[PDB]
Amino acid sequence: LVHVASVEKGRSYEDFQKVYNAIALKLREDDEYDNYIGYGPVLVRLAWHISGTWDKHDNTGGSYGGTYRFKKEFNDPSNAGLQNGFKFLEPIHKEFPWISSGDLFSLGGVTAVQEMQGPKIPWRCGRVDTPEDTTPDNGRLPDADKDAGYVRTFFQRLNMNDREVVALMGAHALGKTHLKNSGYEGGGANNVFTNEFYLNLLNEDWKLEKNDANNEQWDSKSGYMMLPTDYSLIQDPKYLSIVKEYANDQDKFFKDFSKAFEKLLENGITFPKDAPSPFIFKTLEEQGL
Ligand code: HEM
Ligand SMILES: Cc1nc2ccccn2c1N
């Protein structure tokens, strides 16, 4: 199964920078969302869930086809809460109706990471909407109640190795869990992209507690929280080495996250030899906007 990137007709870097800017300006404007976290974290999560359905074995799922717009995928229990991200992006899509849905969802994630002072994420256009019958079934996204071996095996389906997994999970510095969405709660909240996930894992005093949905999670007296799958990264000795590396080197984490996140968002896509190079968008701050 082959998905060839096809540039939206006639479009170039400046067209996509305008879409980036409209997302980024709306991120600034709609600041009250989720007790003033704003929409940055939920857009990152959206970009990960539309990509994380990919299966390397048959090239089903993945960001290319924009299939999150269809009911089956929109209503995945694993996607609860992401409707807020979709609603945020609706007026963007209305203003730029030419961008494909996969390009818009993935660009939302890139824009959010950068606007939250994260690394630059190179981004390529050309995802093409595919029909409703190409929507992957529910159940391809990962469970949070599991251990390191589950996490490792799960991510092999996405062609990610230990380093890529540990780097990606650093996105869990962002946002928060919501009991009504996932059955997890707490850990305060954050809308600045940093390596603090790794510092918190290593430096906090963690207690295994049950939350109000009767699920286990790791809590600290400082009010932070870790999913069982988060905590598994310091229970496994190979993951632990990489956690320590990123806790001690912000720039290395940024560079590895950028590579893994781009790869995540491009899994399943064949880029023609004469496709444009990846775009690196300027932030609003770099533009003086
Ligand atoms: C084993 C892998 C993963 C598991 C089990 C997992 C699970 C979860 C859960 C249960 C939540 C809370 C959702 C809610 O209640 O609203 C969450 C939030 C979040 N996840 Fe993950 N996740 C994983 C990997 C990732 C990856 C790879 C990324 C992106 C690179 C990511 C980005 C986020 C973000 C940004 C949020 C906060 C969303 C918000 O504040 O609305 N996660 N994750
Ligand atoms: C702050 C924070 N953000 C997340 C996202 C996913 C899982 C846990 N998180 C915590 N504690």
Query: According to the entry, how was the structure determined?
Result: X-ray
Q: Decide: 65 in ligand 2 pocket, CB within 6 A.
A: no
For residue 42, give the ligand nearest its CA.
1
Helix and strand numbers (H, E) in the chain are: 14, 5
Domain residue extents for the chain: 1-141+261-289, 142-260
What is d(CA 257, CA 259) in angstroms, rounded to the nearest whole number?
5
The class level of CATH for 1-141+261-289 reads mainly alpha
Q: From 27, 48, 140, give the residue whose CB has the most ligand 1 atoms within 8 Å, as the site to mutate.
A: 48
Whether 177 is in the pocket of ligand 2, judged by its Cβ within 6 Å, is yes
Q: Look-up: residue for tokens 């190979």?
A: 238
The verdict on whether residue 49 carries a ligand-binding annotation is: no
Q: In this structure, which ligand is nearest to the CA of 184?
A: 1
3-state class of 216 per DSSP? strand
244/234 Cα distance (integer angstroms): 9
Pocket test for ligand 1, best of 161, 177, 197 (most atoms within 8 A of CB): 177
Q: H-type helices in the chain, by residue range?
A: 13-29, 33-36, 40-51, 71-74, 83-95, 101-115, 148-156, 162-169, 179-182, 196-203, 228-235, 237-247, 250-266, 284-287
* Total residues belonging to the chain: 289
Half-sphere exposure of 20 (CA within 13 A, CB side): 29
Task: Write the single-letter amino acid at 279.
Answer: F
Q: Which residue among 35, 49, 174 is best mutated to probe the pocket of ligand 2, counting the most ligand atoms within 8 A of its Cβ?
A: 174
Q: Which structure tokens are listed for 204?
A: 């906090």
Considering all CA atoms of the chain, what is the largest pairwise distance in Å, rounded to the nearest integer? Answer: 55
Residue 72 in contact with residue 137, Cβ under 8 Å? yes
Q: Which amino acid is at 146?
A: K
Please tell me the distance between residue 192's alpha carbon and the centre of ligand 1 in angstroms. Answer: 15
Q: What is the CA radius of gyration of the chain?
A: 18
Q: Resolution of this PDB entry, in A?
A: 1.3
Contact (CB, 8 A) for 178 and 81: yes
- C-alpha angle 133-69-262 in degrees, rounded to nearest 5: 100
Which two structure tokens, joined as six digits, stand for 183? 């059955």
Q: Is 69 in the pocket of ligand 2 (CB under 6 A)?
A: no
Asked whether residue 57 is marked as a ligand-binding residue, the answer is no
Helices of type H across 116-170: 148-156, 162-169
The residues near 153 (Cβ < 8 Å, ≥ 6 apart) are: none
Amino acid letter, 98: W
Give the pair of three-digit tokens for residue 249: 């080197």
200 Cβ closer than 6 Å to some ligand 2 atom: no
Q: How far is the CA of 186 from the centre of ligand 1 (A)?
A: 13
The CA distance from 172 to 188, in Å, is 12
Quick one: which atom of ligand 1 is closest to the CA of 189? Answer: 40
CATH class of 142-260: mainly alpha
Query: Which ligand 2 atom sits closest to the C-alpha of 187?
Result: 11
Pocket lining: 138 vs ligand 1, CB cutoff 6 Å: no
Closest by CA to 198, choosing from 237, 240, 162, is: 240
Residue nearest to atom 10 of ligand 2 (CA): 176
| SS3 at position 214 | coil
Rounded to whole angstroms, how far apart are CA atoms 183 and 168? 22
Atom number in ligand 1 closest to CA 180: 15
| Nearest to 240, CA basis, from 174, 163, 146, 161 | 163
- Residue 178 is assigned to a ligand binding site: yes
Phi, psi angle pair for 259, to nearest 5° = -65, -45
Strand partners, 219: 207, 225
